[PDB]
Structure 1
Amino acid sequence: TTYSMCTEKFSFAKNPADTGHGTVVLELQYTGSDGPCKIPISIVASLSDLTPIGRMVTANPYVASSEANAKVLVEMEPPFGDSYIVVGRGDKQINHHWHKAG
């Protein structure tokens, strides 16, 4: 019954884009075949401190299928200032910088 965290690398199929509402939407593509699995995704202040900040709007998203290369749409709310969207862990981690004004 239970699904664990996805173990493989993701890519940004669509880079984060401002929604006009203080959030960003992005699309992920997954390279692994261990789906369904939970996407390791968060917003962090920097790559050296992965303490989660910001706020996920699309919380707890999943890769839905054992099929490779399917897309998952995620909305998230960065904190004011500079942050990084990080997907995956360790040598599978990808990241995208984000700057939010106010």
Structure 2
Amino acid sequence: GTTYGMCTEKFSFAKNPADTGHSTVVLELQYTGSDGPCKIPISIVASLSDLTPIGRMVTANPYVASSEANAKVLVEMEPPFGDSYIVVGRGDKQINHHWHKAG
């Protein structure tokens, strides 16, 4: 109404995450839910046991805008150098993609 919740359903990978050459990574997803508009639960974390967001969001605060199932979504983020995990969704809806960033 005035505020939208986080999206409650699972996301799916439409492509592998891809380096942008600018120290950032682009990820193309689809949203399986139809409860949109809703806010995408996406972050970069150090490990699956410490979900503190440590990756700068280039596409900050991204939304699903559609109410139709399986709409396409694009997000860009800045992983730390070294090892991290890209995480989308929460709990048993969570998808993860381990990432290593070098020079």
Q: What TM-score comes out, normalization by structure 2 length?
A: 0.95
Alignment of 1:1-102 (within 5 A): 1-102=2-103
SS at match of 1:51: coil
Runs ≥4 in structure 1, deviation > 4 angstroms? Answer: none
Identity of aligned residues (%): 98
The CA distance in 1 between the partners of 2:5 and 2:55, in whole Å, is 23
Task: Give the superposition deviation at 1:56.
Answer: 0.7
Structure 1, residues 5-31: CA drift from partner, whole Å, max 9, x if none?
A: 000000111221000110000111001
The CA distance in 1 between the partners of 2:33 and 2:77, in whole Å, is 23
SS at match of 1:43: strand
**Structure 2: unaligned runs, 5 residues or longer:** none
SS at match of 2:8: coil
The CA distance in 2 between the partners of 1:20 and 1:65, in whole Å, is 30
Task: Give the superposition deviation at 1:2.
Answer: 2.2
The CA distance in 2 between the partners of 1:101 and 1:47, in whole Å, is 21
SS at match of 2:97: strand
Q: CA RMSD in A?
A: 0.8
Task: Give the superposition deviation at 1:101.
Answer: 1.3
The CA distance in 2 between the partners of 1:8 and 1:76, in whole Å, is 21
**Structure 1: unaligned runs, 5 residues or longer:** none
Structure 1, residues 12-62: CA drift from partner, whole Å, max 9, x if none?
A: 112210001100001110011100100000000011110110211001111
Instruction: Choose between structure 1 and 2: higher strand proportion.
Output: 1
